């Protein structure tokens, strides 16, 4: 059951801890703080291991995506950001797509637990190039299987 | 004498904008060039406003001319950007012209724009791109030219004035040794024609590139400038109407330069609002407004200068100020600006080996001009020192 | 049902006299486009809005819309297959050079129309003479139109890419085009349509009808100049070679070689003009709401209507095809060039002269026509003064 | 050989134009005027710089040994076809410097034909014009 490039997102850090974390912040600032905090957690991806994952490149930021089916029958995500704050935003996508199937990717409305969380709407992050293109890639990879 | 606040009220942009800081990536645009468009656009069908337009439309490649002191108006060729304006050049003069084992020079602060036609026309005829790099103060080594020039030397591409350092190397010397090896010079004037417009005739330039959107002007629009007897040695560019003067289907002649080399309908309303630009702009001292642009920029490097891990990657105190910070990544710095009412860019500003050059993978960079304002400096003084407080 | 008056009024250029009849050289704006360019050219590109929060977002809503306002004009199976260019001309000028003169071997052959408008002869020309191929006429039927009959006649092992028109700037004519293409594709052949008109009153579902390339400029539908389309099927695209080189269209270059992004990026070096794009967005999505079935059918009754009575004058002669939108003519021992500048005068615009179209109006017998283009903005009231105005051009011309 | 300048003078033009106030005599009476202008055979239309516009337009010269130029041209189009016959009638018979002294379009201000020569520039009466410019140089 180990898995390519690991991550804690899905298993170890949850939507749970996440509404815990992410709930009490009512202030812009301090939600990118959280987030910045939070992409600490995904591990950092050695230029060799990039190569295995889609570039889904923009002008600012290099953010790396990649996926593949687990033993268990579910989808296993994984990625990087140069950035800090979208490695944060990487680190709550992967949390909501993380050890599910195909069929569930394509019943769960894109990016709704960044509105969950108070993220979306609120931070111009979450709503640039780079998060969008992610979100493409996952309903691509999920249509793909 | 320069009156900022006079060249500041004619952009309405700039109650919207709040702090622009992003005038290398493309300029905010006077009433003028608006108003022209908004009336070319609405025009009653089949006097007044309509004789105004034709006169904008018939003047502006004399314009054109008097910005940059081209001999005539017919040494002026209208594209779609600086991207086309030199793409034109490699294929249709270099091209025919470029044996196997012939050099191409290209400088490392060379945009994409002025390298990518080169690797390309390269690619196609066997000659081989040789760099150009810089010397210690981030110029383009011009001192260097002589020992890099060899007898398979052809065309030397430089840029005017690099969109990262606002740098601008000694172009007066490159030309005269790439002449003396008996080659034709690429000048990238996308950057230098908004700041320090060429003299073609006094620079002996052979072809002089620029885009209209970061000259104040329309998108879609571009300028470039050949001497009249590279023109009439062109091929033809895009085929198609009005380049041509007869057709059949046993072969077609052609319109002399520039129609020659302007297939199809002409960006009219590109034209014209370029036209606009231009005429508006020449009510300015541009030496006046470009020295009021970069002691804004001074100010404000002055300022980050304080701030610890701040580097610079200016040259000759530009208009436009590269910079980045010890341990924070260019992306959430441009990130946070914007949240802070702050537009400025990130990124490779499509100069990769220029960066690598300099040892980065990005940098930030905010550009001055002359309808920016000492506020704008605090106001992005006060955004870094915000941004870096959530960052470091 | 389609309101002419209703798709008049949106259109400021004709808010004070003037009759127009040159929309198949250029046409009028509506309110949408005008106000979409005048926004974009009013409004930070960046991204910080303090004022105007809503109308920069409608700006990029519409921008990143554009491709799709245009996929859905055509049928296109997706929104990357839609590639921008300056112009219908250099769409074909680059299918011409980054698609065929790759795989264009000498004695091969380009089967192009003789009434193709330049904008899809010239190119084939050049690249004919680039490779060592050939351009093969494929000649007009009975009708005026290229006779898609003979192509089994002209069709041989050494025909790569058909070159026609979906529809003439001169005669209004189309070809019957899903035939072509069935031959054509019978063949392994690769078909540039030229659809500069046809986009415009008769736009091509090109799905259905199967076309490998399709090309069409936004001005002369209701849009900004210097922006125009470049339709490929998403194998094709991906096949082309990269056009100009430059920012944008590269992923990474150093001084050894660069690589590329996928089409349509691939494809569109440098800074787009992105005023044009978003103009023409905003006349896709304000031409939607209307009809196009109905308001050519009214276009196309105007010029019968014009026609009709024009017939009624000695020496009148038609060379409209297909009861078009389009009326091209002449009258016997008058020049056009008098005729177009009286006429100007009289306070209706029209065109002379040769229309692009030389090998057209050399199998016509002509050196040139007056063309009047009807538009689904011009009037029962822009027939009688059309009429009118010649007549009394005619007078001064006797 | 064509009367412009000498059976035809800016006198007997005046009489003619001068005293017209509506641009459709105007245009009447160019139409007329052009039908004096003979038409320009096949054998010196070859001596002659061609100019495609719209419109086909001719323009040839000869030079006297005194430097007195006589000009010859064509327009297929009748409404330039006048207006060349008067700018013939200012032309004709002119010295290059004579040429360069004047201002050729005077004779159209003149005659009250502005309007007229402004709806014709862009199909023969600009290049026509540089044209005359051009042999005086
Ligand atoms: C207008 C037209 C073109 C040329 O389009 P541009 O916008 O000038 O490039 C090509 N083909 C036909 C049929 C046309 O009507
Ligand atoms: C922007 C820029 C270009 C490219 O101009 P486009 O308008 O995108 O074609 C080329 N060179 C320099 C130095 C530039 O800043």
């Known amino acids: ?145 | 004498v320069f009156n900022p606040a006079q060249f500041r009220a004619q952009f309405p942009a700039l109650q919207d904008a709040g702090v622009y800081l992003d005038s290398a990536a493309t300029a905010l645009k006077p009433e003028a060039v608006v108003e022209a468009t908004q009336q070319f656009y609405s025009l009653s069908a089949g006097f007044a406003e309509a004789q105004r337009l034709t006169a904008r439309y018939e003047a502006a490649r004399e314009k054109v001319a008097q910005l940059l002191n081209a001999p005539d108006d017919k040494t002026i060729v209208w594209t779609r950007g600086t991207t086309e304006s030199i793409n034109m050049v490699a294929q249709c003069y270099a091209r025919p012209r470029l044996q196997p084992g012939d050099e191409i020079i290209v400088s490392v602060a060379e945009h994409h724009a002025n390298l990518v036609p080169w690797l390309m026309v390269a690619q196609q005829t066997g000659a081989k791109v040789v760099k150009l790099p810089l010397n210690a103060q981030r110029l383009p080594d011009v001192d260097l030219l002589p020992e890099l020039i060899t007898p398979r030397s052809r065309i030397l591409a430089l840029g005017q004035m690099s969109n990262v350092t606002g740098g601008c190397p000694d172009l007066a010397r490159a030309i005269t040794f790439a002449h003396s090896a008996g080659m034709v010079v690429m000048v990238d004037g996308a950057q230098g024609a908004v700041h320090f417009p060429a003299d073609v005739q006094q620079l002996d330039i052979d072809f002089y590139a620029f885009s209209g959107h970061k000259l104040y002007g329309p998108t879609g629009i571009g300028v470039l400038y050949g001497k009249s007897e590279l023109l009439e040695a062109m091929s033809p560019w895009l085929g198609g109407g009005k380049m041509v003067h007869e057709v059949s289907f046993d072969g077609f002649t052609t319109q002399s330069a520039p129609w020659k080399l302007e297939a199809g309908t002409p960006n009219v309303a590109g034209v014209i609002g370029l036209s606009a630009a231009l005429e508006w702009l020449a009510d300015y001292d541009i030496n006046q407004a470009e020295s009021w642009s970069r002691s804004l920029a001074t100010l404000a490097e002055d300022a980050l200068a304080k701030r610890p891990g701040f580097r610079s990657f200016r040259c000759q105190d530009s208009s436009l100020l590269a910079f980045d910070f010890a341990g924070v990544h260019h992306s959430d710095m441009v990130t946070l600006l914007a949240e802070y009412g702050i537009a400025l860019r990130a990124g490779q500003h499509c100069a990769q080996p220029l960066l690598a050059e300099l040892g980065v993978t990005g940098t930030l960079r905010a550009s001055f001009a002359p309808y920016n304002t000492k506020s704008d400096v605090d106001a992005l003084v006060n955004a870094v020192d915000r941004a870096l407080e959530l960052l470091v």
């Open chain 1, 1 to 145: 059951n180990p898995q390519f490039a690991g991550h804690p997102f899905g298993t170890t850090v949850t939507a749970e801890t996440l509404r815990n974390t992410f709930a009490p912040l009512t202030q812009w600032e301090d939600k990118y703080r959280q987030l910045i905090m939070l992409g600490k957690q995904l591990p950092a991806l050695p230029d060799e291991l990039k190569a295995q994952a889609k570039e889904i490149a923009g002008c600012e930021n290099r953010v790396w995506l990649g996926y593949t089916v687990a033993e268990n029958g579910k989808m296993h995500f994984f990625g990087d950001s140069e950035g800090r704050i979208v490695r944060g935003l990487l680190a709550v996508l992967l949390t909501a797509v993380e050890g599910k199937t195909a069929a569930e990717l394509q019943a769960q409305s894109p990016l709704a637990l960044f509105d969950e969380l108070g993220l979306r709407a609120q931070l111009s992050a979450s709503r640039s190039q780079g998060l969008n293109a992610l979100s493409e890639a996952i309903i691509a990879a999920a249509k793909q299987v």
